[PDB]
Coordinates of C-alpha atoms in Angstrom, one line a residue:
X23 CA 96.3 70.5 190.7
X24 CA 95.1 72.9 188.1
X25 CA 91.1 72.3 188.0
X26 CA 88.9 69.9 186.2
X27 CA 86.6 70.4 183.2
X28 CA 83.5 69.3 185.3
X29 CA 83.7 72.0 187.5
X30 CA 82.2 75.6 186.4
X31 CA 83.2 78.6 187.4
X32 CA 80.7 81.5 186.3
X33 CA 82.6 85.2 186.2
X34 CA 79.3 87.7 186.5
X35 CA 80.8 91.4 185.3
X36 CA 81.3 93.5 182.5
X37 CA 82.7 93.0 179.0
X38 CA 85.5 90.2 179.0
X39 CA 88.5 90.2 176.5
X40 CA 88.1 86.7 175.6
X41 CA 90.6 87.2 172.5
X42 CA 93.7 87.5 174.7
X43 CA 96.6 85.6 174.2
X44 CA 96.1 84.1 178.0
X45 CA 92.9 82.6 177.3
X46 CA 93.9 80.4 174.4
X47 CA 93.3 76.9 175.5
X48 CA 91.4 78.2 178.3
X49 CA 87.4 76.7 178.3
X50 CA 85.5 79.7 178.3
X51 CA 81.5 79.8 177.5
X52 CA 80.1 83.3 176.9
X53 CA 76.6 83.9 177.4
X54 CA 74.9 86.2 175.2
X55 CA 74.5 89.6 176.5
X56 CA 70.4 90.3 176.7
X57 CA 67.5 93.1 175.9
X58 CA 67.4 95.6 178.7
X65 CA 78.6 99.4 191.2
X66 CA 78.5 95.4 190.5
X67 CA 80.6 95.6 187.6
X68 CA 84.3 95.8 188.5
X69 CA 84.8 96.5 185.1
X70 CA 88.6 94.9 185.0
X71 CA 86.0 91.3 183.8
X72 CA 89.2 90.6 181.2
X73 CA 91.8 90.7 184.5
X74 CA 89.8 88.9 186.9
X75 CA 88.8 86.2 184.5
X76 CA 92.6 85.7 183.2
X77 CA 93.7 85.3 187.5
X78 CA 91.1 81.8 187.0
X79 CA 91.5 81.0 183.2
X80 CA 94.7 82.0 182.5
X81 CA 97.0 79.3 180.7
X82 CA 100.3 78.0 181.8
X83 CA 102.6 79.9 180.0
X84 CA 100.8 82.4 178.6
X85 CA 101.6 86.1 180.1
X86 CA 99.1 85.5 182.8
X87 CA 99.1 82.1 184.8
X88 CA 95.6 81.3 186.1
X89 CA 94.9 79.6 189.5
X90 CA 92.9 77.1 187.9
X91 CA 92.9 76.7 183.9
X92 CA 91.6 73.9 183.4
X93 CA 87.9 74.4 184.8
X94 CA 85.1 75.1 182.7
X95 CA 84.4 79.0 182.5
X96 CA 81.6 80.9 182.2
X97 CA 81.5 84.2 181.5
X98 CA 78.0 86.1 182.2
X99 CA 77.3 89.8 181.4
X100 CA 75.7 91.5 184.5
X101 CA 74.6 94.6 181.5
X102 CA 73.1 94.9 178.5
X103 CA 74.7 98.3 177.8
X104 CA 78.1 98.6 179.3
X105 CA 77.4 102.5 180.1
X106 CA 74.6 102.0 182.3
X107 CA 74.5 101.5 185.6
X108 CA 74.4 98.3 186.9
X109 CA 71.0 97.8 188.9
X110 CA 70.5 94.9 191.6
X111 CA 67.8 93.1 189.2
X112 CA 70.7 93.9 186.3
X113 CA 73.1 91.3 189.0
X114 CA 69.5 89.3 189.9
X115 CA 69.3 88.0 186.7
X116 CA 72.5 87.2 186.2
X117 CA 73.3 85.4 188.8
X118 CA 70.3 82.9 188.2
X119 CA 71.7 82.8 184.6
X120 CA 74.8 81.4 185.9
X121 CA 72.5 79.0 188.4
X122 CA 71.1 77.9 185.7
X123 CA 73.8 77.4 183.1
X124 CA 75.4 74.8 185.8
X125 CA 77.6 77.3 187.9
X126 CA 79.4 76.0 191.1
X127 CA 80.9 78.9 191.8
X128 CA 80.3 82.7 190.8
X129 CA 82.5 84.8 191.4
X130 CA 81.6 89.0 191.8
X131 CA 84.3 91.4 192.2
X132 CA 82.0 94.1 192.0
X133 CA 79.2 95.3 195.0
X134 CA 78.0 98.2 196.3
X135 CA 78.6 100.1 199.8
X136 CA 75.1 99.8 202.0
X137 CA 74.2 100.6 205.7
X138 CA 74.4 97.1 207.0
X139 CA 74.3 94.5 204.0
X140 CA 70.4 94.8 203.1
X141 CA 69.5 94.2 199.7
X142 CA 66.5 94.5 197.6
X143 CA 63.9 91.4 196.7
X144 CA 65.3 90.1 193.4
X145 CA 68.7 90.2 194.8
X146 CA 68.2 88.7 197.8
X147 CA 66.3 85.8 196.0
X148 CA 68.9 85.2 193.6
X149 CA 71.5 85.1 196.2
X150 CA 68.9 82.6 198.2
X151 CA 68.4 80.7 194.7
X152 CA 72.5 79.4 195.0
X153 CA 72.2 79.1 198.5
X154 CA 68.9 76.4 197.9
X155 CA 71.2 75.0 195.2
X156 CA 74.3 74.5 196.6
X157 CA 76.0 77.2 194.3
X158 CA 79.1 79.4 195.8
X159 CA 79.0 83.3 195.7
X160 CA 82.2 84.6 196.2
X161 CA 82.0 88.6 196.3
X162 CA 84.6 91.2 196.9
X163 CA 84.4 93.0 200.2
X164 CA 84.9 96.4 199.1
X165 CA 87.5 99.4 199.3
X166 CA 85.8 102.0 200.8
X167 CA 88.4 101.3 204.1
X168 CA 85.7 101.5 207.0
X169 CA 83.8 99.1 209.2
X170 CA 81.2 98.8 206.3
X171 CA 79.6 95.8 204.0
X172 CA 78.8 95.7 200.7
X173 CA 76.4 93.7 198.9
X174 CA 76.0 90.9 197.6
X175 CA 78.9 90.4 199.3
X176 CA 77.5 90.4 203.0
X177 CA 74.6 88.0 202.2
X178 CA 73.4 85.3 203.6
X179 CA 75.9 82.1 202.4
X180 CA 77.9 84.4 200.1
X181 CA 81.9 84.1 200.9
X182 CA 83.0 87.9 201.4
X183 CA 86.7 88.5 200.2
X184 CA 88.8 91.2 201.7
X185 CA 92.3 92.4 200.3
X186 CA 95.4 91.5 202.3
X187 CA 99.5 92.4 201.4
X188 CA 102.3 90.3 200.6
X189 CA 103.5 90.0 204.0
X190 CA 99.8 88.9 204.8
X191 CA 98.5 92.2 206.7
X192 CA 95.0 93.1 205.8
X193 CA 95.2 96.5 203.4
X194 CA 94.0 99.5 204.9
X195 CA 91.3 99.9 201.7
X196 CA 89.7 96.4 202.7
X197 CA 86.1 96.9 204.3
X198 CA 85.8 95.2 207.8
X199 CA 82.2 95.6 208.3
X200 CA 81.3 92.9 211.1
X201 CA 79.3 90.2 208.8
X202 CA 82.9 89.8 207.6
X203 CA 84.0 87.9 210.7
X204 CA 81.7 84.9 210.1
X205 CA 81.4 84.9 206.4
X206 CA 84.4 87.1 205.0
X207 CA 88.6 86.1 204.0
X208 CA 91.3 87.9 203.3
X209 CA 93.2 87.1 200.4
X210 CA 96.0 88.6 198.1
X211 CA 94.8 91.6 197.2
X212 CA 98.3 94.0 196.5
X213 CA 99.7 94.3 192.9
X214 CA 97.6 90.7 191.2
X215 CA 99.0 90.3 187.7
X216 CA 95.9 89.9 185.1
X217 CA 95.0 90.9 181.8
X218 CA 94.4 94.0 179.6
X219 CA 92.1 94.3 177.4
X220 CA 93.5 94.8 174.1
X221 CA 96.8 93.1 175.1
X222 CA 99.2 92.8 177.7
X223 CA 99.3 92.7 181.2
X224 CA 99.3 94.8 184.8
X225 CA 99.3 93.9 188.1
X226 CA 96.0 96.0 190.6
X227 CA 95.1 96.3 194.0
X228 CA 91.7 95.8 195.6
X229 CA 89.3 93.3 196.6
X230 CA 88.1 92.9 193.2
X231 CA 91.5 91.2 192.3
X232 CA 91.4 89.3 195.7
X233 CA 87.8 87.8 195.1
X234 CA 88.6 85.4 191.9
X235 CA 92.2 84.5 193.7
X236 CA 89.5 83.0 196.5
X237 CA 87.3 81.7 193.4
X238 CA 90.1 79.9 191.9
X239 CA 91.1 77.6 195.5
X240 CA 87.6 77.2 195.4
X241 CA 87.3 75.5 191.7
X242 CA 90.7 73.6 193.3
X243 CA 89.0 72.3 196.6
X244 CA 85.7 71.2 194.3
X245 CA 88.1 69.8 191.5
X246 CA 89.9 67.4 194.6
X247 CA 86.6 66.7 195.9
X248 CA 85.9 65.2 192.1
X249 CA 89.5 63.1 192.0
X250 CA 88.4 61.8 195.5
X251 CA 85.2 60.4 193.9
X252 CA 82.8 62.4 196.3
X253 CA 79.9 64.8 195.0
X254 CA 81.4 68.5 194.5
X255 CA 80.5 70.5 197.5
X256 CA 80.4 73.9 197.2
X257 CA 79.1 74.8 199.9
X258 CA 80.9 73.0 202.5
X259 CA 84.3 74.1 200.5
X260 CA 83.2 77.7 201.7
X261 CA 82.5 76.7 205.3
X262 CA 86.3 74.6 204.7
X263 CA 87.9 78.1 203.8
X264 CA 86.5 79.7 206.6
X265 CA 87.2 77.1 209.0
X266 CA 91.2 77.0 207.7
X267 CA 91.2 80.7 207.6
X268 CA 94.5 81.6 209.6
X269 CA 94.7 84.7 212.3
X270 CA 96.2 87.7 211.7
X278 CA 91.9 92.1 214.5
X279 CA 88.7 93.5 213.3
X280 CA 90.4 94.1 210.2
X281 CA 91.8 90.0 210.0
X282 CA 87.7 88.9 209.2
X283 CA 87.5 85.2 210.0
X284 CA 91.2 85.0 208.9
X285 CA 93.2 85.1 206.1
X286 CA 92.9 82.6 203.1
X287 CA 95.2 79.4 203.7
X288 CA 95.0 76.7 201.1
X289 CA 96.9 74.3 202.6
X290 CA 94.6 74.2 205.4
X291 CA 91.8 74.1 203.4
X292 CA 92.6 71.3 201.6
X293 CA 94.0 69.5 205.1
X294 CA 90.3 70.3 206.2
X295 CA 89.2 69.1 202.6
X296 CA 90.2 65.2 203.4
X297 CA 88.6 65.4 206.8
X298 CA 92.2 66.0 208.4
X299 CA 93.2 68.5 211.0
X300 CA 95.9 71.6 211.1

């Protein structure tokens, strides 16, 4: 229940501590960062809440898939543009990616996006490829992109006691494409060393991105073709009610994985 090596998990942001201790033993693949916002830049935290190995300081939701981490820069200063995130994404399309997750994105009017973006995004929708992109904390009935795109699964940031946080942007797209998931004080990595526990949806997005790599790693042990795809549809489907605020629901993994083997909650 802790992944498979045969499914890939792509983490598109900026630089990525892959020296700390919680990623020893983890399989992590870093492409080469190329010749000349999205970036959350915490890429060391939200890779460690996938990669993270049992009992190291930072537990991962699933360890034992095959990571790859992609830099969305070439200089970490810059800003970030949406051909910057283009190209990155297709370099994770084409490096064998299931899933890619994006904690970072960018506040817009109503989720447009510009031509190499939206192509990209398009590219893992013809593909079968799963974006999973962080809603946003900008607190108002807003989308960000890539989030809000077509086939992307949005992630919003709820509490422990499952309430959606105020932060979490409810923009409308949300409701048919976006969860909510834990997104109060998630323990990850420093880089450097050590630990700390953030809030936002950047934190909640690879929490999502992890129960995906799980649903896809099942879908392997039950000898059927990994879906990724249909595992999105399954978490939004499973998604359990809270209203606005709730988006299609909040993340529920035993439901999804009920759904998963064609059962019913």
């Amino acid at each position: 229940l802790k992944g498979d090596h045969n499914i890939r998990v792509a983490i598109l942001d900026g630089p990525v501590d892959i020296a700390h201790p919680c990623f020893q033993g983890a399989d992590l693949t870093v492409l080469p960062t190329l010749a000349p916002g999205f970036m959350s830049a915490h890429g060391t935290h939200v890779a460690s809440i996938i990669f993270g190995q049992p009992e190291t300081s930072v537990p991962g939701i699933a360890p034992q898939c095959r990571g790859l981490i992609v830099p969305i820069f070439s200089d970490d200063r810059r800003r970030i543009t949406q051909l910057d995130l283009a190209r990155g994404i297709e370099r994770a399309v084409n490096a064998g990616a299931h899933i890619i997750n994006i904690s970072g994105g960018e506040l817009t009017d109503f989720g447009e996006a510009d031509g190499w973006l939206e192509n990209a995004v398009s590219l893992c929708r013809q593909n079968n490829v799963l974006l999973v992109a962080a809603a946003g904390n900008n607190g108002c009935d807003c989308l960000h992109v890539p989030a809000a795109l077509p086939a992307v699964l949005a992630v919003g940031a709820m509490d422990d006691h499952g309430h959606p946080l105020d932060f979490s942007n409810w923009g409308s797209t949300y409701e048919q494409q976006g969860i909510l998931a834990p997104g109060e004080d998630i323990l990850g990595a420093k880089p450097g060393g050590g630990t700390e526990r953030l809030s936002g949806t950047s934190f909640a997005t690879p929490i999502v991105s992890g129960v995906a790599a799980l649903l896809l790693s099942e879908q392997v042990r039950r000898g059927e073709t990994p879906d990724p795809q249909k595992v999105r549809q399954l978490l939004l489907q499973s998604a359990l009610p809270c209203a606005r605020r709730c988006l299609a629901g909040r993340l529920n993994v035993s439901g999804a994985f009920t759904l998963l083997k064609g059962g019913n909650m």
